[PDB]
Nucleic acid binder design. Sequence first.
RNA 1: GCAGAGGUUCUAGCUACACCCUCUAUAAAAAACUAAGGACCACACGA
DNA 2: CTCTGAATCTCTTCCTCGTGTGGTCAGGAC
DNA 3: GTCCGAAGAGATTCAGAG
Lengths: 148, 79, 49, 1337, 50
Amino acid sequence: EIKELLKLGDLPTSGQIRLYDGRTGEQFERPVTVGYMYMLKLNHLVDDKMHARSTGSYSLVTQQPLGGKAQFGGQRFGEMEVWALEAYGAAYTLQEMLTVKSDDVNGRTKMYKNIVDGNHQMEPGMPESFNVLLKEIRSLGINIELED
Amino acid sequence: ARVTVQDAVEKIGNRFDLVLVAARRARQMQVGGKDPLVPEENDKTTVIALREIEEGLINNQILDVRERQEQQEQEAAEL
Amino acid sequence: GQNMRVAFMPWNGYNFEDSILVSERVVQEDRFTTIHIQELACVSRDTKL
Amino acid sequence: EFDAIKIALASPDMIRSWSFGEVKKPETINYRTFKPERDGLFCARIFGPVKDYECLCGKYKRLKHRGVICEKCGVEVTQTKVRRERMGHIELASPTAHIWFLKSLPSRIGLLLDMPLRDIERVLYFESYVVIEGGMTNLERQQILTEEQYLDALEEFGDEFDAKMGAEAIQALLKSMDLEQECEQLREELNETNSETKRKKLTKRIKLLEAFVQSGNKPEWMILTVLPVLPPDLRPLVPLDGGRFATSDLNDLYRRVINRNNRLKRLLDLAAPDIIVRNEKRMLQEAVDALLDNGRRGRAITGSNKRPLKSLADMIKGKQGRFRQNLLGKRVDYSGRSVITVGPYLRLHQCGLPKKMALELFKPFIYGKLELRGLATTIKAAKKMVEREEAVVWDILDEVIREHPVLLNRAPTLHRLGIQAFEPVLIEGKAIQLHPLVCAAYNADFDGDQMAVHVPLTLEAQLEARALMMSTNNILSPANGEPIIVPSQDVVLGLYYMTRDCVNAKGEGMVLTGPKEAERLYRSGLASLHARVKVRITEYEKDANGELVAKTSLKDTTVGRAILWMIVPKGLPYSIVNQALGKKAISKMLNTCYRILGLKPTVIFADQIMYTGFAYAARSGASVGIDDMVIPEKKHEIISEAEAEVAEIQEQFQSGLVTAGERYNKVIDIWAAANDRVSKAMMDNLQTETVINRDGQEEKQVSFNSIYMMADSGARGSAAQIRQLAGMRGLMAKPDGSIIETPITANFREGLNVLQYFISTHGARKGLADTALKTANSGYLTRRLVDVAQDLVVTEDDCGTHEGIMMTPVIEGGDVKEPLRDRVLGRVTAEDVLKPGTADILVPRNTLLHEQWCDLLEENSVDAVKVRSVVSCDTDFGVCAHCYGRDLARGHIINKGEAIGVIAAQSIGEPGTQLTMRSSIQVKNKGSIKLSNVKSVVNSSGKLVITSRNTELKLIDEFGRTKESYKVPYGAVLAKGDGEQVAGGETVANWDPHTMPVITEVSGFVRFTDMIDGQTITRQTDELTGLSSLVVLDSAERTAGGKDLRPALKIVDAQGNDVLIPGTDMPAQYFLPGKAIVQLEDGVQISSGDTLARIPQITGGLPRVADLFEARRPKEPAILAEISGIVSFGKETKGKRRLVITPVDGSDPYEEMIPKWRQLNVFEGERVERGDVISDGPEAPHDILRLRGVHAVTRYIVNEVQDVYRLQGVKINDKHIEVIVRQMLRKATIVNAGSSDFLEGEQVEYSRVKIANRELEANGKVGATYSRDLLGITKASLATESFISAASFQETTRVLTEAAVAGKRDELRGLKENVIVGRLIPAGTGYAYHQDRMRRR
Amino acid sequence: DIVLNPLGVPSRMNIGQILETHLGMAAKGIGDKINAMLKQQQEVAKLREF
RNA sequence: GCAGAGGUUCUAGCUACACCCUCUAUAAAAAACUAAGGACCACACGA
DNA sequence: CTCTGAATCTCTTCCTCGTGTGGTCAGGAC
DNA sequence: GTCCGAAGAGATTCAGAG
Ligand SMILES: [Mg+2]
């Protein structure tokens, strides 16, 4: 039935045309299928998913977006990311990510002022989220100490 | 610009010592006043450090030699 | 959605794995432009003084 | 700044030391005034000031007044950040129990007080009294009594007897107990009380007591009398809309605790009657329980929106807790996300990047460059300039992204190839553009997939990204030696279209003057792309020490193949391109380039091969027309035949000739055969459909049907897939798995009927639901594995241990699954690998097995090398370098500092997505018949029958390589003798599938000694021949008469004496099991090797790997004997049967209550060996290790997990499993303390006792004896000496409580610990920093 | 206007989208066949019979 | 530019991450400029 | 009879990210 | 203005057999 409908129109029955190339202007060998597929357009556009953060908000735990990266918040260097990074051996990159790029507010602002000066130094500092954990597990009778 | 690091690691063949030595060299070339002993071609300090390594000019012991030479020249003008 | 001419062939890898390669003719004739209506609520609260 | 973390129990004095005040007001900040209340949970006076250098009042607003408490309001003028460090203590009106000890799994309060947890709860929650200092009265210090009993005891003694009630009573009991005296007394009775259950419990209690007295903490501190609070800023009031300021789900918990404490204080101030104060104190204790962990006891409290409150333990444990959400996975700045797409114009070290998000990323870099260049003076001016994105900003941005790698990252990253780096190129649009070839590693799908992008900032981090992250530096995947940067689907199709041949094409037979002339011919259209020609190539082989020869020669080749000869660098031969170049061919071509020319030419390849593949797949026009899918005209005839056969079978069943199951199996098999015939017809019509004109006569060759091009080349689509597309769909199963009798006759080209589509949807939805649940369970397993092997980091160039693994090719009955070539490639020999001729060291004991050595081994008849595996290493805190061989991701041995534990755990967990979760012995080919652990008996017939249980038939060739292997059942009759050379395709052995025959060792007459008729046996009627065959009755189901005596069949000679086995004095009596159908009578002459009786005779997916790595003993485990000797049934199955082993030399202590529900294949008179399956079933890993050694358990586990992985085709080198196993059995159990200090029942880390013994052997004093205890990873990771590593993983409450009571201290020295604390990880670029730090210490 | 990737058809077995493609081509063929005899004016009889 | 205040603007501007000048108890000749910000559960999904 | 074992109850963890939609969070009486 | 499933794994009870 579809073949006969094709043959009614002045169209090839095989359903394939010889699409000449747009740039080379040469015939495509192995004639290619051409037809009118009903292409939709899904709601998942890109301009509502093109996100990027330099430095914005912070939380009580000094995480950037915490609950919702829609408030101009950075990506989550998630649980598996630190494994996939330390598997290489990116100690400096990992230390960046989880101390000076995300958590160590003193170190974070110090490195910001450093980068705006051409120099690219880094200060480890103490991850403020680790200080939050320290205070929490210390607030329940279990004494915790950064003993040296 | 450059693409690979094999010609760099081959003489620092731990692939981790390379990172440390080229990092401190790029430090002395970026925050310090040292000029690249390898010609610069609009290239950042990292690839410049790699090029200085691949030319058989910058290595860990050479960096220590430069550091102690700077120390001697500093303490020579303090006496 | 809409419907437009479709040809099944690898065109210089731009449709490498599953990606579509729509022509500038689609955008030119305003074929797939979609209106999106956003809403910006704003309230006036009983603030003191 | 520090090097360790200390854990203890905060006594109610250091709580006051921490706390800067006592919270007395339940009120938080007022709704009317933002200022906090006088002494509320939020309070500037006893915490930090609300604003920096500003007190709560306006008295000292000016910063001038620094560090001075304001007299007017009693508030300091310190910076407000201190509101995150200050604490406050709640002075409980009465002591209250700590939940982390009461009603917990460790049950520390239970072991300590030696009370039932029920009774402790009863006294604490005020249900019943507990006595203290009973004295003269019958009640001791440890008794629990009800209120009526309390009245009676008060009658017994008015005051000397004391029964305090509530938590105060427990406090007093803890005070009265002295650890040291109790500890030594408990040791005293531990030395005598030999009851195993009592021994375990007493060892637990004594361990608690010792680790609690040696650690600096008293037992009174379990009962918290002074609760501290979180810093107010760590527990704030967030919003301003709707209900002004909402809560934090913890302020209300603290308010409830404060309110209960205040009401109790008021009652104590008013001396209320004891019943109401009991109620008040009980609900105070309950409120403290809810604060500690809302949900450890009873109805978790709630006053806000009918949901459990997020208690403090809630904020620590679980994913949502701080440890996982906020510590290991901190969201990062300088990051971005966008749906990604493909760009061929990019190189391999490059990635697309939108100008918008690149500008939003490198804003500090843009500011710095602008300030340097003078285009702005202040950060405000730079912000304005970049917000207007002037044209002076774009060319500066392209200046700052000259050599600045960015970390692309996919969200569900599994392997470390899931986050690489590229030099981003600034392009328009909103989508990051990923190079196609690096999507195979990423598992990128380009259907709306979003990849996070991260920017390293510090020049050390940028350089580290360039050296390690960048895609051109990690081409070799760490899972296997197969390269991961492989042309995936479209470029390979283009290359296949290029590198092919058709016997007639425009301009064929032309002779070419080089590949450049071939390109000129094709681009001019004179010659077809795949015409056959003769070209003049110039191959460049490297026979010298790195130099090339210019070998010029003609090659009968195709124009398309000649096109690719301009793409290969010099060092490759032409035969690598003279073929069709499918998928495997292209992957092998890339691998050959990597192993010959290095890495830079291989990147040049990757990029150029992608370019040419795309550029010629474009001109290919590789369509998919429906007419390209030819229906086999043969298929309809085959379907008619299948219909005739199924009709015949069905009508036969309509007469009852066949059974329902028989009809089912026959129709299934005939439909499967019809499907196979249809597949063969479809192929034989499709793969040669082109019948072309060969300058005259007619010739047919490989067809150019586009579907067959896309399938045969390996581009996209398998032979089974295209078969289910064009031919039959075969059959498909129901939900359970039993397939339909009526298959799917039609296919996808022609129409598919409704019922057929429903049957298809069955399997489709099955697979879809399975794959979603698979991704869930695989992610969980990957986390578990990477958290059990996180701390293993290579830290030594060599361990200096001769011990290794006797690695051999795997032959599990079939052919070789993993040949010795790819088995021991990249590993290091453990000992002197000799050659067949002895006294010839073919390989030194310390040489890496790279390509040359493994190639030399094959030609020189290798069968068994020894490799120094990681499980055989001895260095504490990580394996050595030579214990691990090559990193397998780079072209050399492992670098001293890599993190092989994480890479291996990822390489194991990554194929989880690819891993789903829902006779006779005939010889094959040439070789001999050799057997080990063999007890072959030559029967009188002359054939071979074997008494041994674990006797293995292996088909060794004329050289020695074990090509084929087969297990030999007990009593199986063999064709020829041991070592005999047989032909090929021959049958060599068989047996009775449901009959273990009782064979004979010496012929003679038989006497039914100890065989009572009717009771021990049944002369059951022979319903076929008449001569009744005896059935030996088991002692259980028999009558009460013969249960004392055991069945026996003793052989006798011509005189009737006891015939015995030569060597063992015990006679040749053959005991019988139950249901043993014996078809003989006493005094019947049999042969030496004749039968005597007749006795009648589970997951393979991701759960199998989980069960393996969890060391789960199966529900039906095979039971083995821990000592070699004679088998016996000691007791008369009194409750359960018994097995006693009597070795000749050693003593005979053994008793095992084998459940009376197993087919114990071992009889009752056979000398079993230590580690023999007396029953049959899945051999549990624990007893495997404890009865056959570590080198056996590691071999078994790696073989089985690889079999699970090889079944799906995913390649994983065995080191990634051996390291997991080494981290899996790093725990020992002390068997003899010796001169050291280790309790017997103690289960302490293996490295600790190994170091202790290695330091004791420095003197003559003997060390300690141990037995390595294989622990499942989910609680092998939880048993580590470090405590934060286990705390992050799972069961945070359990591990934290155990660390607290033990006073444990963390000496980080680990990857996850340093990650949590944030310092450099001791694995990678930070390994040198950490080795320097440990050198300074 | 659009160039799909052919290699998504065999593996991701959705051969219907090619039947859809051919039928859409036939439908647009009918559309332009009547457009031609409607662009240049043809009487109602010829168009009606077609 | 480190502890405060004043200045020509615009209430207030002392490095608060923050932008110019003065001195240690006194307020103006002067153009580019300003704000340090926010939690927990259910649902549609997407890879 | 008391202790190796049968059971019993109970507790922790279950891809990791996003786009987002929302819903939610201490009064009247002295 | 201030205030009242499933899966396993382990800890814990019954029992049943010496
Ligand atoms: Mg995808």
